[PDB]
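can u pls check wat happens w/ methionine
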Amino acid sequence: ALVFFAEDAGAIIGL
Amino acid sequence: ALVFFAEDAGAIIGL
Amino acid sequence: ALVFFAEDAGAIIGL
Amino acid sequence: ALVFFAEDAGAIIGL
Ligand code: MET
Ligand code: MET
Ligand code: MET
Ligand code: MET
């Protein structure tokens, strides 16, 4: 599984 | 919807 | 890239 | 945060 980051403030973190 | 970035090397883009 | 589904109603779709 | 499922075979879980 990869770590994905979005910005929305702070980081939205997808595992 | 958000733009997500991972890396694995280079970037991996998520929508 | 994988298609990810969550439920929140309808499907939240991650590309 | 949501629970996401993909498949690739078997399930791939995202948080
Ligand atoms: C697994 O790879 C997962 N963290 C991907 C982002 S959350 C759908
Ligand atoms: C929509 O925002 C999509 N790019 C990400 C859904 S959360 C896994
Ligand atoms: C790429 O694999 C992408 N669709 C994963 C879910 S959105 C972060
Ligand atoms: C939080 O909801 C996390 N499991 C998914 C973030 S959107 C890629």
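Residues A 1-2, 4, 14-15; C 4, 14; D 4, 14 surround methionine (ligand 1) (CB under 6 Å).
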